[PDB]
Amino acid sequence: KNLVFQIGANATQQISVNIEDMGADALGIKEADGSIAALHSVNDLDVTKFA
């Protein structure tokens, strides 16, 4: 779903846009790796694991 824009009054004169963040987005291994690299942002391992 490329969030293109249209610019030229003629054809093909477009732009490409990239928007990817989410609260489940953190350290970019590839994706939400596991409990880490996305979900310390979400789940926050500092409960008692961090003790």
Partner: protein, 51 residues
């Protein structure tokens, strides 16, 4: 000669009628034209605004 003069005068009438016809159809195409200008405004504005 009177043959040619009379027939030629009525021919001038014929030609002026032709000018009338072509004038009408021409102005019609002028309106068509301006409308299609608005159409291109609506194809740029329907560039999905990109998306």
């Amino acid at each position: 000669m009177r043959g040619q003069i009379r027939g030629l005068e009525m021919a001038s009438k014929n030609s002026q009628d032709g000018i009338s016809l072509i004038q009408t159809a021409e102005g019609a195409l002028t309106e068509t034209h301006a409308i299609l200008q608005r159409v291109r405004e609506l194809v740029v504005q329907a560039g999905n605004t990109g998306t």
